[PDB]
Amino acid sequence: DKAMAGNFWQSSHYLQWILDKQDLLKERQKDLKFLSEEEYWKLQIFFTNVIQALGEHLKLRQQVIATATVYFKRFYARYSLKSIDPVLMAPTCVFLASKVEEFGVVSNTRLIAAATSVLKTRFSYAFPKEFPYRMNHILECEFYLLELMDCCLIVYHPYRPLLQYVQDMGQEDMLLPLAWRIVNDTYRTDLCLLYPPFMIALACLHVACVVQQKDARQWFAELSVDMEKILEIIRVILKLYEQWKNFDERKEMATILSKMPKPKPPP
Amino acid sequence: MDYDFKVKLSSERERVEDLFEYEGCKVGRGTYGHVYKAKRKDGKDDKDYALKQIEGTGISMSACREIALLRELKHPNVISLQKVFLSHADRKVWLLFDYAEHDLWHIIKFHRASKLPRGMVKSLLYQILDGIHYLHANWVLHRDLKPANILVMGEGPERGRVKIADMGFARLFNSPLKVVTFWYRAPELLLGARHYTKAIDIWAIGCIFAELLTSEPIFHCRQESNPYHHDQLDRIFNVMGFPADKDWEDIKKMPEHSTLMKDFRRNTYTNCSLIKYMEKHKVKPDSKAFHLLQKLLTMDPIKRITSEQAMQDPYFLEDPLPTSDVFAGCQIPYPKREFLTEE
Ligand SMILES: Cc1ncc2sc(C(=O)N3CCC[C@H]3c3ccc(Cl)cc3)nn12
């Protein structure tokens, strides 16, 4: 789907959903009463992985999965984890993202079956009970999601600019698979809420070049871009890999999930 | 869901029935849903609004894509989404627009019923091309362009400005195959083209332009699965002539080409041409208007002009120049929309 491809600078993404880092951290403090900063990041990583598994099981293209991931992040950038259960929100984000695209639809029974099967087969370390929600909960949650994103549905990702950069380098076979995988990894951080996607793409490509010992200094010099911001993004990517190393998702998440604030019922 | 979160959002939610007076003010009902002429209940402004309750419940592909695209698109000749209201109780979606009193269907009928300043037709075409070009430059196809969907603003600050509406937002796999008229459908659609294209929109603009010039649909035929429609093709050939091999080399690649060859003979249409058709409806074939029309109504979609090139045509540099107000400051003779009282 190439809709709005050259419109980023007049887009809802750019104009409303490139957030201030200090505003984001300010809104986050409500949930940091229950969780440490490290625990909150681990929770973000976990639900990114959940959304990825849901999308893979549904056979969705990576761009749809990425859109679902940014819907999830946008929701919890603004609201508390207790507002709506993230176990319900994740499949809802996948459902809505799938409908913004045009090549195929995710049916109701297929979404619920995917949520149930994926959580059982790939996430039983986190979740002792089966997926408890039915399709009416997804549909209700979808209305809240759409409203609370201010109906902003078109999301730009680093994949398209990355492809253009790697083509321009003439290094598709060398650098693209690794750089693409590093783009996937950036969704385990806040970067998509903070930087234009092309900047994230350049940072991922830089790390790919360093890993593979490819000298691209002159090519990165030929770009008219704020390299200080690219370096900021690289530092977050390098930090993610150190956290990844020190994080055992499977051993820690049940404990972290129990510490999450939970939706208060009616009186 | 957190209860405090729920009651807070319920307290704060703007509801269409509380914000707008639209009871008994329905101006249209169709596949799109229900369209009302609305006014704000608090007197903050005195403007007229259009309120559309989308057909069905929940968020359909049509609704999802309509909201997704209109949330981003910003151009004077594309209808602007002002607000979205989500009604949780009945799962209904409401879209708010600035109200367009007129559209090309009703303008054309008004002229047809009579049997227009100098540059009205030209001004309409230019603005249609401007709006479609903006969509196309953003890789958005309209896919259902017709006189009924080309709105024109009435009295107010946007007097006589074209607003392209009803963009046909959801077509599975971008495919035309997945009371109907085929008068604005490009011949490649009729021969089984698997995907919508920019060229398909351009053909429809050509049809609309011919209709604005004559007040008659150029490829008129009877109304009413299979994309192949025999009588519609017959009508196109009776107007345009039958394409030579050299006119449309890739016609052989169309899935219904062999059906076309079975049903039609070239010789049937030997004295038929757009020149002769337009001569009968008092359009001069040596006019710049005609030469542009002929470029829009090219049978081979790869030989059809783009919206950009159409906007650059010297037709638009010839007196009279197109105007922002297509009525050119003259008094609007067209009647206002009537309200629907049918059950
Ligand atoms: C009158 C009007 N002003 C602004 C707007 S958007 C809007 C719409 O959704 N649509 C969908 C089909 C074509 C258009 C329309 C046009 C006329 C009428 Cl009677 C009803 C609907 N209609 N409309």
Domain definitions of chain B by residue range: 1-99, 100-343
Query: What is the CA(B28)–ligand 1 centre distance, in A?
Result: 7
The data reach a resolution, in angstroms, of: 2.2
Say yes or no: A265 contacts chain B, CB-CB below 8 A.
yes
Any A CB within 8 A of B7 CB: no
Method: X-ray
Q: Are residues A149 and A183 in the same domain?
A: no
Look at ligand 1, atom 11, and give the residue with the nearest C-alpha. B166
Nearest-neighbour CA in chain A from B37: distance (Å): 23
CA A200/CA A162 separation, integer angstroms: 9
Residues A149 and A67 in one domain: yes
Q: Does A85 touch chain B (CB under 8 A)?
A: yes
d(CA B4, CA A168): 52
Task: Choose one of A121, A154, A187: the last residue of a domain.
Answer: A154
What domain range is A168 assigned to? 1-22+155-267
Q: Chain B closest CA to A211's CA: distance in Å?
A: 36
Are residue A250 and residue A179 in the same domain, yes or no?
yes
Token pair 């929600």 in the structure block, residue: A133
Residues 6+ apart with CB under 8 A from B185: B200, B203, B204, B229, B232
Domain B1-99 is found in CATH 3.10.129.10:
no
Distance from CA of A115 to the nearest CA of B (A): 18
In this complex, do A103 and B173 lie within 8 Å of one another by their Cβ atoms?
yes
- Closest ligand 1 atom to the C-alpha of B32? 11
Residues in CB range of A33: below 8 A, 6 or more apart: A261
A102, A163: one domain:
no
In a 13 Å sphere around the CA of B36, the CA atoms on its Cβ side amount to 19
Q: Do A264 and B4 touch (CB under 8 A)?
A: yes
> Coil, helix or strand for B237?
helix
Residue at which a domain ends, from A130, A154, A178: A154
Cα–Cα distance list, B125 to A129, A160, A205, B159 (Å): 62, 35, 46, 16
Per the structure, the count of domains in chain A is 2
Ordered DSSP codes for A140-200: HHHHHHHHHTTT------SHHHHHHHHHHHT-HHHHHHHHHHHHHHHTTSSHHHHS-HHHH
Residue nearest to atom 19 of ligand 1 (CA): B28
Angle between helix A172-186 and A227-246 (nearest 10)? 70
Q: How far is the CA of B37 from the centre of ligand 1 (A)?
A: 9
Contact present, A49 and A249 (Cβ < 8 Å): yes
Phi first, then psi: give them for residue A256, nearest 5 degrees. Answer: -65, -45
> What are the two backbone dihedrals, phi and then psi, of residue B53, each rounded to the nearest 5 degrees?
-85, 110
* Token reading at A1: 């789907």
**Ligand 1 pocket test target in B22, B142, B151 with most atoms within 8 Å of CB:** B151
Q: How many alpha carbons fall within 13 Å on the CB side of residue B47?
A: 15
**C-beta atoms surrounding B263 within 10 Å:** 12
One-letter amino acid for residue B111 of the chain: H
Q: In the numeric block, which tokens belong to residue B297?
A: 């109504």
* Yes or no, beta carbons of B61 and A99 under 8 Å apart: yes
Q: Quick one: A16 and A93 in the same domain?
A: no
Q: Please give the backbone phi and psi of residue B100, each rounded to the nearest 5 degrees, phi first.
A: -105, 110
Domains B1-99 and B100-343 share a fold: no
Sign of the alpha-carbon torsion through B131, B132, B138, B140: positive
* Beta-carbon separation of B140 and A3 below 8 A: yes
* Domain match, A78 and A159 both: no
Q: Domain B100-343 carries which CATH code?
A: 1.10.510.10
CB B167 within 8 A of CB B142: yes
Residue with tokens 């903006």: B134
Residue B51 Cα to ligand 1 midpoint, Å, equals: 9
Tell me the residues of chain B between 140 and 199 that have a Cβ less than 8 Å away from chain A: 140, 170-174
Q: Are A93 and A65 in contact (CB under 8 A)?
A: no
Do residues A141 and A175 both lie within one domain?
Answer: no
Choosing from B98, B103, B144, B201, the catalytic residue is B144
**B321, B311 Cβ separation under 8 angstroms:** no
Which residues from chain A sit within 8 angstroms of residue B174, using beta carbons? 102-103
> Do residues A46 and A148 share a domain?
yes
Tell me which residues have their CB closer than 6 angstroms to ligand 1. Answer: B 27-28, 32, 35, 50, 52, 79, 97, 99-100, 103, 148-149, 151, 165-166, 337
Query: Catalytic site residue B4?
Result: no
Known binding-site positions of B for ATP? 27-35, 52
Exposed/middle/buried for residue A65 (C-beta within 10 Å: 0-12, 13-18, 19+): buried
Residues 6+ apart with CB under 8 A from B234: B221, B264
Q: Which residues of A touch B86 (CB under 8 A)?
A: 143, 146-147
Instruction: Show the tokens assigned to B249.
Output: 């080399």
Query: By C-alpha distance, which of B21, B54, B50 is closest to B37?
Result: B50
Identify from B72, B80, B135, B173 which residue to disrupt to test chain A contact, counting A C-beta atoms within 10 A and taking the largest count. B72
The answer to whether A264 contacts chain B (CB < 8 Å) is: yes
Q: DSSP secondary structure string, A189-232? A: SSHHHHS-HHHHHHHHHHHHHHHTT---HHHHHSS-S-HHHHHH
**Nearest Cα residue in chain B from A15:** B72
Assign residue A222 the CATH number of its domain: 1.10.472.10
Is A72 found in the same domain as A6?
no
A100 in reach of chain B (CB within 8 A): yes
